[PDB]
Structure 1
Amino acid sequence: SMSYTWTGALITPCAAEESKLPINPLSNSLLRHHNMVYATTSRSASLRQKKVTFDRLQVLDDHYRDVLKEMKAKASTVKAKLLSIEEACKLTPPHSAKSKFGYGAKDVRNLSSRAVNHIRSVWEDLLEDTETPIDTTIMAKSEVFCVQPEGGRKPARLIVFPDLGVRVCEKMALYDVVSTLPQAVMGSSYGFQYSPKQRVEFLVNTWKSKKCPMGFSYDTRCFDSTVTESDIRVEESIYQCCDLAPEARQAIRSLTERLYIGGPLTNSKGQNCGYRRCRASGVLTTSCGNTLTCYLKATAACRAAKLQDCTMLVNGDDLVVICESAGTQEDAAALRAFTEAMTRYSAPPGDPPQPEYDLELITSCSSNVSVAHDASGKRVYYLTRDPTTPLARAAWETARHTPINSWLGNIIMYAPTLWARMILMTHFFSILLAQEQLEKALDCQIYGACYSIEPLDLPQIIERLHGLSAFTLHSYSPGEINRVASCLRKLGVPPLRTWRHRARSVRAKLLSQGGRAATCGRYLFNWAVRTKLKLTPIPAASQLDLSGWFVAGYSGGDIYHS
């Protein structure tokens, strides 16, 4: 069975596609080598199509069934609620793709008669029809990267999603399930429950619990394409262990057969492009589904491989396992056996995995633990990453208007990092000052969910999320310092010392404004003065609403929070 079948109809764009930085960047002030920055377009879709299209052979064993049953017994403790139309409507991002049935995201959020009417009709239809495949749209996604160190460019990812009406119904039937079940099933292994500070803590603690730790990330090639119809049905079998309202159970059953296992792909012109028999990227269960499936196959493969004292951390298709070593040679062998197992379960690797005996050298979720020191000199651990993509996208978002602001997300998730503090914070606060946009809330994504956040709130958010040490870190590791340096060289970003300069001015302009703006000056930019102003815990940090921030992943799920 093929992940995809294609009729020949093109994957088409819906509007003009921008592929390059504007002719004279609105901030060469961030980045000089504009030619290094690019966005993906539908022009590269057929390249992705070729990579993403293959036959899935799948052989399940006793290990897999054992783990599945263990997973199901945990799911059996769960009681899930049906969401009302209203609650599901309020989870719809203001800029979610409009319905073909003559209403859009705003109409849904407003509970307009036409939208609510269609939605209800889509719900009844899930009860009245348990078989007919539900239409989807396939599109080339727009994402910005830095060119490979070789005119090497990634082709566009392909997104597949059903109509806005179906999407609201998914929320009603499955939002509570996808938010609750994964922690219930996978426990400490479910990544999305963790803030950056909590994730690093769990990693570092797992590391130390091993007499002699060995760790490895595992990169599945095109995970979404490796998800089989069987995988999707096993996923449902897990879901079905929840206590569920009768209509939720039927909605789940119908959605599974009519939407999740596959169905026809329609381009933006309304032409039939082909047929999907693998995971769709743009449905509510994509993150939860991918996580359960990765966890299930990986845990079974750990048993097949006789890996010992495995502790896994799973985020959708991102997998990192830490275990007890048996010697360099036996580790290598066991890992090869882990890979042959995952392969039989239909998940071959992209890059073959490698045992790693230094926690700091393992990268998972595009990130790695590193070490620095706080004011008191004490050792502090934090999560970082190669800043290349974050910087490219910051430059793109500076030059072209963008609906979602990755830079704000990266500042929140990576607030303690050397590059987020010196470049990103300095750069964007400067722009915001000049345009008096400091008070205006912006949209950003955290674990796939959309949030609307006021920049004048970063100090609180950062403190409660990362700790007061997020404002004092110094003596960053050599490797980190080199990685950043190399990156500024690549993209033509001015050197750190220059940012220290721009920072002093920004910080001074902030302090002169008093109030929240002043707090941003003291806390966010205290790294820029040698006369380091003593930083005490912020009053607001404690009395804010940061609950729903790290509960579950909603990547591709059309989810809008608060």
Structure 2
Amino acid sequence: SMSYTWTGALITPCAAEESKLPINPLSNSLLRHHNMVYATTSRSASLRQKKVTFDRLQVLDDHYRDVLKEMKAKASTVKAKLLSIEEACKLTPPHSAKSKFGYGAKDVRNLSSRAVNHIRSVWEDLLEDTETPIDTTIMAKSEVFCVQPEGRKPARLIVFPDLGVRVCEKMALYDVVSTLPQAVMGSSYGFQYSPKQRVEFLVNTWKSKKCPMGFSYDTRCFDSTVTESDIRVEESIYQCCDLAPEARQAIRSLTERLYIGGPLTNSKGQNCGYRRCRASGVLTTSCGNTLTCYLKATAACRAAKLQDCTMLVNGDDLVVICESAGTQEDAAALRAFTEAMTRYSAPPGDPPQPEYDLELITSCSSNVSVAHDASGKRVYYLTRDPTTPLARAAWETARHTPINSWLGNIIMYAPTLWARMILMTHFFSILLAQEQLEKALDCQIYGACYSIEPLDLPQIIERLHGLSAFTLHSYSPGEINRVASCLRKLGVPPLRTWRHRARSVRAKLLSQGGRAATCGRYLFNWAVRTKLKLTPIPAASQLDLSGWFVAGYSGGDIYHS
């Protein structure tokens, strides 16, 4: 069976799509090579459609079944609650795609009599109807990138059900999908970790091995490799939770009717094809992908007889650290592993490379690098090639986009050379210039959408990274060469120029006192020679990030207000 069948109807946009970076005074001071920056559109959808459509091979074995039972054993631990319509709506992001049935996200959030009635009827139909496939829209996602060294990416696709359904998924599954991965995978579940916690875990795992070997594994179009069996097995795990009767039935109907496959419709309302694999835009895609990657990966480790495997799983991204048996025997073990995964229907994009320095391993586009704090002590932190973040920064500088990936990157990659000298300097300079310092902004962390105030960045950074994040220096030469190389490529002024801009911006922040001066002091301490003494922020210890690093939610339509 094929991941997709198509009718021949086009994947259509519903608004004019922009694709080239505008020529803007502001984004041009960040990034001069504007023709290198682009956004994907509907126009490239048929290339993706080809790429994402293939037949699937899946043969299961005892290792797989053994691991499944063990996962289910842990699942059986879990009790899960139905959300009320109220809670479910409050998790709806304000600009979520409006229902086809005469109400939108703002009406859902207000608990408008119309929206809520529609939701209740959707819910009842979920209890009453087991079999009727639920409709989904398919859309070309618009993401921005930098052009490949030699050529472009075609748009990614997003498959989502009507708003009314999305709300009913939250009611049935929000507590499950955000409690159960932890219960099952334990320390292997990556979305439980803040940035410093992920680092502690990777370094500690690495340091705990007599002789560590590690690799990342990258299955191509993970979503299209997920089969109906996979999605049903994923359901068998959810059914181990203590569930209210209505949620048990709702998950069962949602599984047959939605998760397992269904019909696709384009913005024009046209039958477009049929999906027989994971939908990218539902509440369970993050969790399901995590359980599924975990289940197969664990089974494959056993298949390859890898020793003392520790893995970290976040949706489809997967990293394994384990005991090196020797170069030859590690190389042969990885290939065995890959062929095991391939049989479970998770073949690799590129074959995994056994790796013997932690810094060389890369997952979620990020690697571990070293720097030194104030005392000179070695500090590990997560970083990445900054090209895509930077190109997106230029884009978002020239366009009011609904999500500010620049804000997210500052939060997630705060200790990096490039986030501190470029993102902060650029964006605080702009925001100062436009009186926008106190204006809250949307970004998303691990899928979930958050409204954040720029002036709160120093406390958030403290909590997510520690004080260390404000004092790192003596980055690794390879990291500096990567960042420097990247700027030449993109036409971003050199780091030397950003220090000069930072010094200026820092002054202006200190001028303003209060929360703005806090930013100047902590965020830009790197910019001045006569550094200020930096101590814990009172407001950081205090305030509240309960929902931040609990679970993955990408595609799930989640907003934490």
Question: TM-score, normalised to structure 2's length?
Answer: 1.00
> Distance in 2 between the 1:523 and 1:84 partners?
41
- Is 1:186 the counterpart of 2:188? The answer is no
User: Does the aligned pair in 1 maintain the 2:421–2:495 contact within 8 Å?
Assistant: yes
Residue by residue over 1:436-482, the C-alpha shift from the partner in whole angstroms, topping out at 9 and shown as x without a partner, is 00000000000000000000000000011100011110000011000
Residue by residue over 1:148-187, the C-alpha shift from the partner in whole angstroms, topping out at 9 and shown as x without a partner, is 001x111100000000000000000000000000000000
Residue by residue over 1:379-415, the C-alpha shift from the partner in whole angstroms, topping out at 9 and shown as x without a partner, is 1010000000000000000001101000000000000
Structure 2 counterpart of 1:44: 44
Q: CA RMSD in A?
A: 0.6
SS in 2 for 1:58: coil
> Distance in 1 between the 2:158 and 2:235 partners?
22
User: Does the aligned pair in 1 maintain the 2:285–2:554 contact within 8 Å?
Assistant: yes
User: Does the aligned pair in 1 maintain the 2:192–2:549 contact within 8 Å?
Assistant: yes
User: Does the aligned pair in 2 maintain the 1:19–1:41 contact within 8 Å?
Assistant: yes
User: Does the aligned pair in 2 maintain the 1:127–1:251 contact within 8 Å?
Assistant: yes
Structure 1 counterpart of 2:226: 227
**TM-superposed deviation, 1:26:** 3.7
Residue by residue over 1:169-214, the C-alpha shift from the partner in whole angstroms, topping out at 9 and shown as x without a partner, is 0000000000000000000000000001000110000001110000
> Distance in 2 between the 1:6 and 1:75 partners?
37
Residue by residue over 1:219-249, the C-alpha shift from the partner in whole angstroms, topping out at 9 and shown as x without a partner, is 0011000000000000000000000000000
> Distance in 1 between the 2:232 and 2:41 partners?
33
Structure 1 counterpart of 2:412: 413
User: Does the aligned pair in 2 maintain the 1:225–1:279 contact within 8 Å?
Assistant: yes
Which consecutive unaligned segments of at least 5 residues does structure 2 have?
none
Residue by residue over 1:315-367, the C-alpha shift from the partner in whole angstroms, topping out at 9 and shown as x without a partner, is 00000000001000000000000000000000100011010000000001110
SS in 2 for 1:430: helix
> Distance in 1 between the 2:468 and 2:411 partners?
14
Structure 2 counterpart of 1:534: 533
SS in 1 for 2:362: coil
User: Does the aligned pair in 2 maintain the 1:283–1:556 contact within 8 Å?
Assistant: yes
Residue by residue over 1:297-320, the C-alpha shift from the partner in whole angstroms, topping out at 9 and shown as x without a partner, is 000000000001000000000000
SS in 2 for 1:54: coil
Residue by residue over 1:479-529, the C-alpha shift from the partner in whole angstroms, topping out at 9 and shown as x without a partner, is 100000000000000011111111011100000100000000000001000
User: Does the aligned pair in 2 maintain the 1:286–1:555 contact within 8 Å?
Assistant: yes
Question: TM-score, normalised to structure 1's length?
Answer: 0.99
**TM-superposed deviation, 1:537:** 1.1
> Distance in 2 between the 1:124 and 1:519 partners?
52
User: Does the aligned pair in 2 maintain the 1:94–1:105 contact within 8 Å?
Assistant: yes
**TM-superposed deviation, 1:56:** 0.7
User: Does the aligned pair in 1 maintain the 2:166–2:557 contact within 8 Å?
Assistant: yes
Question: What is the total number of aligned residue pairs between the two structures?
Answer: 561
Structure 1 counterpart of 2:143: 143
Structure 1 counterpart of 2:314: 315
User: Does the aligned pair in 2 maintain the 1:393–1:407 contact within 8 Å?
Assistant: yes
> Distance in 2 between the 1:19 and 1:466 partners?
35
Structure 1 counterpart of 2:345: 346
Residue by residue over 1:241-296, the C-alpha shift from the partner in whole angstroms, topping out at 9 and shown as x without a partner, is 00000000000000000000000000000000100000000000000000000000
**TM-superposed deviation, 1:57:** 1.3
Cα 1:259–1:25 change in 2 (3 A) is farther
| Identity in percent | 100
Which consecutive unaligned segments of at least 5 residues does structure 1 have?
none
> Distance in 2 between the 1:283 and 1:175 partners?
11
**TM-superposed deviation, 1:24:** 3.8
> Distance in 2 between the 1:105 and 1:303 partners?
46
Structure 1 counterpart of 2:55: 55
Residue by residue over 1:88-127, the C-alpha shift from the partner in whole angstroms, topping out at 9 and shown as x without a partner, is 0000000100000000000000000000000000000001
Residue by residue over 1:33-84, the C-alpha shift from the partner in whole angstroms, topping out at 9 and shown as x without a partner, is 0011010001100100111001111000000000000000000000000000
User: Does the aligned pair in 2 maintain the 1:25–1:34 contact within 8 Å?
Assistant: no
SS in 1 for 2:263: strand
**TM-superposed deviation, 1:23:** 3.7
> Distance in 1 between the 2:399 and 2:352 partners?
38
My pick for the range that moved more, 121-130 or 24-33, is 24-33
User: Does the aligned pair in 1 maintain the 2:56–2:227 contact within 8 Å?
Assistant: yes
User: Does the aligned pair in 2 maintain the 1:173–1:252 contact within 8 Å?
Assistant: yes
**TM-superposed deviation, 1:27:** 2.0
**TM-superposed deviation, 1:25:** 5.3
SS in 2 for 1:280: coil
User: Does the aligned pair in 1 maintain the 2:27–2:395 contact within 8 Å?
Assistant: no
> Distance in 2 between the 1:464 and 1:207 partners?
24
User: Does the aligned pair in 2 maintain the 1:216–1:320 contact within 8 Å?
Assistant: yes
List aligned pairs for 1:208-227, cutoff 5 A.
208-227=207-226
Structure 2 counterpart of 1:496: 495
SS in 2 for 1:247: helix
> Distance in 1 between the 2:443 and 2:201 partners?
25
> Distance in 1 between the 2:230 and 2:22 partners?
44
My pick for the range that moved more, 537-546 or 165-174, is 537-546
User: Does the aligned pair in 1 maintain the 2:470–2:525 contact within 8 Å?
Assistant: yes
User: Does the aligned pair in 2 maintain the 1:373–1:474 contact within 8 Å?
Assistant: yes
User: Does the aligned pair in 2 maintain the 1:137–1:160 contact within 8 Å?
Assistant: yes
> Distance in 1 between the 2:86 and 2:391 partners?
39
